[PDB]
Design a protein around this ligand. Sequence first.
Ligand SMILES: [Ca+2]
Ligand SMILES: [Ca+2]
Ligand SMILES: [Ca+2]
Ligand SMILES: [Cl-]
Ligand code: NA
Ligand code: NA
Ligand code: NA
Ligand code: NA
Lengths: 4, 473
Amino acid sequence: XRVR
Amino acid sequence: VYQEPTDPKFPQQWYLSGVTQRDLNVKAAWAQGYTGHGIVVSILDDGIEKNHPDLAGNYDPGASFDVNDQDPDPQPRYTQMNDNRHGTRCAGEVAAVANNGVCGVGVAYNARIGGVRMLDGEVTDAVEARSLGLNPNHIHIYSASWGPEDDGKTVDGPARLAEEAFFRGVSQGRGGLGSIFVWASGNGGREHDSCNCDGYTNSIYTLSISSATQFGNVPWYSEACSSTLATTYSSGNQNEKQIVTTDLRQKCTESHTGTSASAPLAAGIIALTLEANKNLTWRDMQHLVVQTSKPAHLNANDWATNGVGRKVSHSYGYGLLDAGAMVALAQNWTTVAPQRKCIIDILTEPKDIGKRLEVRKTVTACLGEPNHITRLEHAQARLTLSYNRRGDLAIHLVSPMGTRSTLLAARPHDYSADGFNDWAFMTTHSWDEDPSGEWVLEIENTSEANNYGTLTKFTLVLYGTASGSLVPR
Ligand SMILES: [Ca+2]
Ligand SMILES: [Ca+2]
Ligand SMILES: [Ca+2]
Ligand SMILES: [Cl-]
Ligand code: NA
Ligand code: NA
Ligand code: NA
Ligand code: NA
């Protein structure tokens, strides 16, 4: 996997 | 009578107000008396600087938790690279304090703001679920500027606990009215990503928000898809202004950017709307967004008019949010009827895809049954198919009212041979249309390669009601  | 904020960077918040007409019309909502008082927003991200000079006055520990370290305090972890500044920037967009001589102001500068520290660690299904399901009878609106990797190859969505959190949220959250989940549609523009390959944005339970540059263009990072609902301003090229917000280490930044900045602005506008009518359901809120959002002055090559006369783009949804129009319409809003769900299994036999497959089916949309739908909300084409190179596929769905939704555009980096396993491609573009009649699904190979595969299941899932239509636009 999860990214900003 | 209304006095706009005097904060030092408020004149730089071009997206909140200006005479230029390129703004979100937020001052008009402030002047109607709506600044967010009583509404609670939580930023699901890498933490929130709860002592920031421009957040302390609005900070709400009841809207906050640290899921990464399992404690109540969502304070960011400070590093040399300032990696964990992201949540604090998002929080200031929603609810930075007004008229305090610091930085700028939030959209809902009198709302209460919290943060869930959940990105600074391994982001498991359970982590997402505990974040999405945090204090659901205290938090009104959840904002998420994160999601699956934007490499243009991934197909990924909420696993079981997270999907259960969404369903529990919209069903029992906020007194049964339903949690409002606001999602950033993604940053995969350079990778030719599609936000329909992202189950968080593609969900009917989230309001997926895209971005427009100051000059009204589709930013480099933008992802096109049919599940997007609306747009707010964000960054663009270096001649266009950016987003002004609170930064890590008690600072102010004028250079917050990307899809990440659009969701918080939407969450703030939704906070103002909830102040204007606390009785709005989660579906009410999506209806208000559809009816009030503004295409004008947004440039795109794919604007189309749907069956009820509304312009819709895969880059922008129904267009720019309009805070003044949202709060005005919300005040005397009549609650929509309970949501109906009509499940239509389309195929009688598997179909080889080849170079092109067109599947036509005339449907009655549960005519004569309690789930009869004459007013569509979301529509899903839940597809199961095999294919040798997934990113060569383009998928389109045409409604009986003639509205052509791109469910999937070509993704050059998607080499996967895994196909789609009951993937629920969603479109908002046929909202308020009558779904009775001929639907058309088109699957095509966009490459010159001799590709091959089989469509084994196509479930058309329609959501909506059977009452209360407006005269088409
Ligand atoms: Ca902590
Ligand atoms: Ca301020
Ligand atoms: Ca994406
Ligand atoms: Cl459902
Ligand atoms: Na409910
Ligand atoms: Na969504
Ligand atoms: Na029809
Ligand atoms: Na036709």
